[PDB]
């Protein structure tokens, strides 16, 4: 689908075979989302951003459903208060910026 | 022009009379961009993103130009890590997610 930006670009998203929204951030370059239940190991990261930094669990291969459509990579969990879609999974749902 | 995101999404951007590149950021709201010299006054104001707030110069009405297209709207110029073009000035370029 085509989106447009006068709203936060949400999208649900299904991982760990469960239900969230996600907001589609093309100036991420990882995929954050808020405290979820994911199985097995992970490895202890520190992501910077606006405010500065959060350390986070790193999950890599993860499959997760954006919008109906599915790709794997790596998800972190760490504490943000928006679930973010990084470009890491943008690229594999063929997302793409027009103007 | 259509963008794809397997590289970050820059643009250069004319404001204040000065040249910079920005990211054209889904994820946010707002403009934000790092230091720069912009003329006038403003209103204070504190923004958040991942890791915390950051404190930040409010412009209003500031002339932008994001590739070839002209956009006016508040800007806002703090300790940011990178320039941001935010959906307040992206809806005014057109700018659109398809995937």
């Known amino acids: 689908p085509q989106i447009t930006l ?3 670009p949400l999208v649900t998203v299904k991982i760990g075979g469960q239900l969230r929204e996600a907001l589609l951030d093309t100036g991420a370059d990882d995929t954050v989302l808020e405290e979820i239940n994911l199985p097995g190991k992970w490895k202890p990261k520190m992501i910077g951003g606006i405010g500065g930094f959060i350390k ?4 890599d291969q993860i499959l997760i459903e954006i919008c109906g459509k599915k790709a794997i990579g ?3 969990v760490g504490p943000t208060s928006v679930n973010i879609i990084g470009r890491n ?3 594999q749902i063929g997302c793409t910026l027009n103007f």
Chains 1, 2 share one sequence.
């Not at 986070?56 to 999950?59: E, I, L």
């Open 6 to 8: 006068w709203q936060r």
């Open 56 to 59: 986070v669990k790193q999950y």
């Open 74 to 76: 790596t998800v972190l």
């Open 89 to 91: 999974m943008l690229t």
